[PDB]
Design a protein around this ligand. Structure first.
Ligand code: SF4
Length: 81
């Protein structure tokens, strides 16, 4: 299974991830990216049909703020860092 989350401290709100994977990433009230699947908690398995879009967003994030793992983040974008 794959999980994903945005590090809100490092996101620079550059527009890339919503363009790459709009069914995974959008922008909060402040304009900062977040994962819509689970409100940035890193607890909903990414649907099969969205995995390729996830990969595009992951590689295309300039600050490496988008995280991907085989394990839930449960609210901590830095669980694996
Ligand atoms: S691609 Fe990365 S830095 Fe740009 S808005 Fe998305 S999470 Fe933030």
């Amino acid at each position: 299974p794959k999980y994903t989350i945005v590090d809100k401290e490092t996101c620079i709100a550059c527009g890339a991830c919503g363009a790459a994977a709009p069914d995974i990433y959008d922008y909060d009230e402040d304009g900062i990216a977040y994962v819509t699947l689970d409100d940035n908690q890193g607890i909903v398995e990414v649907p099969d049909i969205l995995i390729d879009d996830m990969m595009d967003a992951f590689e295309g994030c300039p600050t490496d703020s988008i995280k991907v793992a085989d394990e839930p983040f449960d609210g901590d974008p830095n669980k694996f860092e």
